[PDB]
Amino acid sequence: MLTYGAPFNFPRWIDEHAHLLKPPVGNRQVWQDSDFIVTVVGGPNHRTDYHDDPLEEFFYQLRGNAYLNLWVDGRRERADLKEGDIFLLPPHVRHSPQRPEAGSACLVIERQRPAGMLDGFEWYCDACGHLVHRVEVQLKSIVTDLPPLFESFYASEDKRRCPHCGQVHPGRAA
Amino acid sequence: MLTYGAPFNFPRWIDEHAHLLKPPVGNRQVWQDSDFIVTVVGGPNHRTDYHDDPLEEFFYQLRGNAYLNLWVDGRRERADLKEGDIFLLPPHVRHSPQRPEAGSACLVIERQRPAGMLDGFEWYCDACGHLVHRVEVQLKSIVTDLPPLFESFYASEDKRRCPHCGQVHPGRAA
Ligand SMILES: O=C(O)c1ccccn1
Ligand SMILES: O=C(O)c1ccccn1
Ligand SMILES: [Fe+2]
Ligand SMILES: [Fe+2]
Ligand SMILES: [Fe+2]
Ligand SMILES: [Fe+2]
């Protein structure tokens, strides 16, 4: 059977879910309990965490523009997602997506992670660039598994303290 | 490093590869040697084989219209991919994509299959509906692993012969 339902018009779906593609929610997963995790992410949203995904991430910036702050070869780099761009991110490339525009929409496709394959979330020192804190998580549900992780970092000067230079990371906004 | 390169404009890429999105080639994979197999499929193309994919298939019909002939719950059914539609096909749902329109373009995303996880290709009797022939294949490369499979079916009245009613399947065109 068609477990995931029939085909349906994507622009219409995006328009119908526009109220969820903005703060405070910001994103909406298309199908539940599927192997391919298909999400539409809107904006505005800025963030300071880097994601270490053990599998690939596919991006197709449908409306508006965004960018990914990356670590590439030990250096801070930026990959721009201009409207119309597609991009495939290799496993483990650290990325912090920034989505400054309201009304923007990006198709992001990932795979469910197998048991034992963990995701990392990391923060780096604005002053010296050293890793400040890393949490590894078995990501089963984004909604329940992820926000408390972020909240616990923001609430803790210990977690936010750079082990190299001692500077306390700002937390939620940089 | 960005193994798969930087982001790039998708409509421009599709326009630049338009000569490959029509007979005799018909499709073009976007990135090589990636876990996510990302393809753009054009037209026109009609076919008689059903695919039994052990993993999910994601579709986004970007330009023009297409449709999938399916077996759902023991009955012949059709899922239309109208321009703008997205669709997620569950594993093992038999599907025969038909792409009647020139200039059409559909984003199709699949995963590389692990060793031991095989794809099936099947043909069914137009008269009685019984399975006529099935081949299982470890799909490593579409270009080399798949066309000879199809050719060997078309060239063989034995393979094309229905075991229930004896009718010889037409082969390439129905
Ligand atoms: O939710 C994710 O997995 C993700 C996607 C893009 C950038 C950072 N994180
Ligand atoms: O190439 C495939 O895996 C495929 C895709 C869609 C329909 C039939 N086959
Ligand atoms: Fe990510
Ligand atoms: Fe520091
Ligand atoms: Fe298929
Ligand atoms: Fe038959």
Curated annotation (Swiss-Prot), chains A, B:
It comes from the Bacteria. It catalyses: 3-hydroxyanthranilate + O2 = (2Z,4Z)-2-amino-3-carboxymuconate 6-semialdehyde. Fe cation 2 binds at residues 125, 128, 162, 165. Gene3D superfamilies: Jelly Rolls (2.60.120.10). PANTHER family: 3-HYDROXYANTHRANILATE 3,4-DIOXYGENASE (PTHR15497:SF1). Catalyzes the oxidative ring opening of 3-hydroxyanthranilate to 2-amino-3-carboxymuconate semialdehyde, which spontaneously cyclizes to quinolinate. Homodimer. This is 3-hydroxyanthranilate 3,4-dioxygenase. It comes from Cupriavidus metallidurans (strain ATCC 43123 / DSM 2839 / NBRC 102507 / CH34) (Ralstonia metallidurans).
